[PDB]
Structures are given as C-alpha cells and as structure tokens.
Amino acid sequence: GSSGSSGGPSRMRHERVVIIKNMFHPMDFEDDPLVLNEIREDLRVECSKFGQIRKLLLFDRHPDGVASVSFRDPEEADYCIQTLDGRWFGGRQITAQAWDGTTDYQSGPSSG
C-alpha cells in the first residue's frame, strides 16, 4: 500500500461466474419441465447458501448438463466453487469451477 489516488472507481475487475457439470440433461426437460424447474431453482438456492445469486443461466442444450451461476462478490463464488464441486443434482454428483470467457455454451457467433 501507499499514498496516491485513494478511491475513484467503484467497479469490479475479475471473474464472478461459475460452471457446473453432470447436474442435468437436455433429455429430462423434453419429458417434463419440472426437471429444469427444480434444477434451475436449486442452483439459485444452493449458491445462496453463501450469499445471493446475481444471475442464473441454465444451458438446457448441452447433453453434459451445463449451468452458469453469476455472483456479486469473488470471495463467495471462489468459495462456492469448492463447496459446490461436490453437490448432487437429480441424484448424481456435480462439479463446480470458475469461468473465464472462452466456452461457447450460451455465447453466440460474433460475426456477420
């Protein structure tokens, strides 16, 4: 630390999103919505245990069950990724991790 510009900007510059695998399947939603309902809400109630859910996005397209849980503070997520890496959804276990910005799960084509 040192004197200087003490203050000014009030924004965060770091990853604040987490991904989950083996939590759901795009085949369970085809039979009934509830599946996605309970699952989605579950991700919001699970990540809340530590704090709140700034935003949630369930990718009901990937056959490997992929979800994106946004967080407000990096302290929570970073800690929610290690505690959620062992969660169980639909009866099976799931993994957690911090996203960066390379996957094309929800993202789209940035051309034409």
Short mmCIF file of C-alpha atoms in Angstrom, two decimals:
data_model
loop_
_atom_site.label_atom_id
_atom_site.label_comp_id
_atom_site.label_asym_id
_atom_site.label_seq_id
_atom_site.Cartn_x
_atom_site.Cartn_y
_atom_site.Cartn_z
CA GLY A 1 0.00 0.00 0.00
CA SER A 2 0.95 3.65 -0.47
CA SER A 3 -0.44 7.18 -0.77
CA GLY A 4 -1.95 8.40 -4.02
CA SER A 5 -5.38 8.09 -5.63
CA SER A 6 -7.27 6.77 -2.60
CA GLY A 7 -10.59 5.98 -4.27
CA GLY A 8 -12.23 6.96 -7.53
CA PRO A 9 -13.52 3.94 -9.47
CA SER A 10 -16.12 1.66 -7.91
CA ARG A 11 -16.22 -1.39 -10.18
CA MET A 12 -15.01 -5.00 -10.02
CA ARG A 13 -12.47 -6.45 -12.46
CA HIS A 14 -12.42 -10.23 -12.07
CA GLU A 15 -14.27 -13.46 -12.86
CA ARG A 16 -17.57 -13.72 -10.97
CA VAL A 17 -19.18 -16.74 -12.63
CA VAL A 18 -19.14 -20.49 -12.02
CA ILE A 19 -19.94 -23.52 -14.19
CA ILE A 20 -21.48 -26.87 -13.28
CA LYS A 21 -21.28 -30.28 -14.97
CA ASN A 22 -23.24 -33.52 -14.65
CA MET A 23 -26.13 -31.70 -12.99
CA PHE A 24 -28.88 -32.03 -15.60
CA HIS A 25 -29.70 -33.30 -19.09
CA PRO A 26 -31.47 -31.81 -22.14
CA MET A 27 -33.42 -35.07 -22.31
CA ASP A 28 -35.16 -34.69 -18.94
CA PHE A 29 -36.73 -31.37 -19.94
CA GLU A 30 -38.22 -32.93 -23.07
CA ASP A 31 -40.30 -35.25 -20.89
CA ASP A 32 -41.21 -32.67 -18.24
CA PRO A 33 -40.33 -29.04 -17.39
CA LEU A 34 -40.29 -29.65 -13.64
CA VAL A 35 -36.85 -31.20 -14.10
CA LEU A 36 -35.40 -27.90 -15.33
CA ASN A 37 -37.53 -26.00 -12.82
CA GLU A 38 -36.31 -27.78 -9.69
CA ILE A 39 -32.78 -27.85 -11.12
CA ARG A 40 -32.62 -24.16 -12.01
CA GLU A 41 -34.17 -23.01 -8.73
CA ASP A 42 -31.85 -25.45 -6.95
CA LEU A 43 -28.79 -23.71 -8.39
CA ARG A 44 -30.15 -20.38 -7.16
CA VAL A 45 -30.92 -21.72 -3.69
CA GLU A 46 -27.62 -23.60 -3.50
CA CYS A 47 -25.39 -20.67 -4.43
CA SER A 48 -27.41 -18.55 -1.99
CA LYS A 49 -26.27 -20.64 0.98
CA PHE A 50 -23.13 -18.50 0.84
CA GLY A 51 -24.82 -15.30 -0.29
CA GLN A 52 -27.06 -14.34 -3.20
CA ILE A 53 -27.47 -15.15 -6.90
CA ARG A 54 -26.68 -12.09 -9.01
CA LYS A 55 -27.86 -14.08 -12.03
CA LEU A 56 -28.52 -17.65 -13.16
CA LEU A 57 -28.40 -19.27 -16.60
CA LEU A 58 -29.23 -22.93 -17.22
CA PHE A 59 -28.00 -24.29 -20.55
CA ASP A 60 -30.76 -26.77 -21.36
CA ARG A 61 -28.97 -27.61 -24.61
CA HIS A 62 -25.71 -29.27 -23.56
CA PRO A 63 -26.06 -33.06 -23.14
CA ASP A 64 -23.49 -32.76 -20.35
CA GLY A 65 -25.60 -30.56 -18.09
CA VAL A 66 -24.03 -27.11 -18.06
CA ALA A 67 -25.16 -24.17 -15.91
CA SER A 68 -23.81 -20.68 -15.25
CA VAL A 69 -24.22 -19.10 -11.81
CA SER A 70 -23.21 -15.44 -11.58
CA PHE A 71 -22.00 -13.97 -8.28
CA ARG A 72 -21.72 -10.46 -6.86
CA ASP A 73 -18.52 -10.98 -4.86
CA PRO A 74 -15.48 -13.06 -5.89
CA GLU A 75 -14.98 -14.19 -2.29
CA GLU A 76 -18.26 -16.12 -2.33
CA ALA A 77 -18.05 -17.76 -5.76
CA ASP A 78 -14.41 -18.73 -5.29
CA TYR A 79 -15.64 -20.46 -2.13
CA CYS A 80 -18.85 -21.73 -3.71
CA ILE A 81 -16.89 -23.44 -6.48
CA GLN A 82 -15.07 -25.62 -3.95
CA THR A 83 -18.21 -26.41 -1.96
CA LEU A 84 -20.45 -26.89 -4.99
CA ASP A 85 -17.92 -29.16 -6.70
CA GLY A 86 -19.45 -31.97 -4.67
CA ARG A 87 -23.14 -31.07 -4.86
CA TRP A 88 -25.72 -33.61 -6.01
CA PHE A 89 -28.38 -32.84 -8.61
CA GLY A 90 -31.06 -35.17 -9.94
CA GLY A 91 -29.45 -37.81 -7.76
CA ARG A 92 -25.95 -37.56 -9.21
CA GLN A 93 -22.94 -35.54 -8.08
CA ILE A 94 -21.79 -32.37 -9.84
CA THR A 95 -18.60 -30.33 -10.20
CA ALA A 96 -18.00 -26.59 -9.87
CA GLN A 97 -15.42 -24.17 -11.27
CA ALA A 98 -14.77 -20.54 -12.20
CA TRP A 99 -15.48 -19.49 -15.78
CA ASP A 100 -13.33 -17.10 -17.81
CA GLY A 101 -14.76 -16.37 -21.25
CA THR A 102 -13.86 -18.97 -23.87
CA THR A 103 -16.68 -21.52 -23.79
CA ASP A 104 -19.41 -21.15 -26.42
CA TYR A 105 -22.22 -22.61 -24.31
CA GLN A 106 -24.60 -19.64 -24.25
CA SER A 107 -22.41 -17.20 -26.17
CA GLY A 108 -23.05 -16.78 -29.88
CA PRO A 109 -21.24 -16.03 -33.16
CA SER A 110 -19.61 -12.60 -33.09
CA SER A 111 -19.55 -12.11 -36.86
CA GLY A 112 -21.74 -11.22 -39.82
#
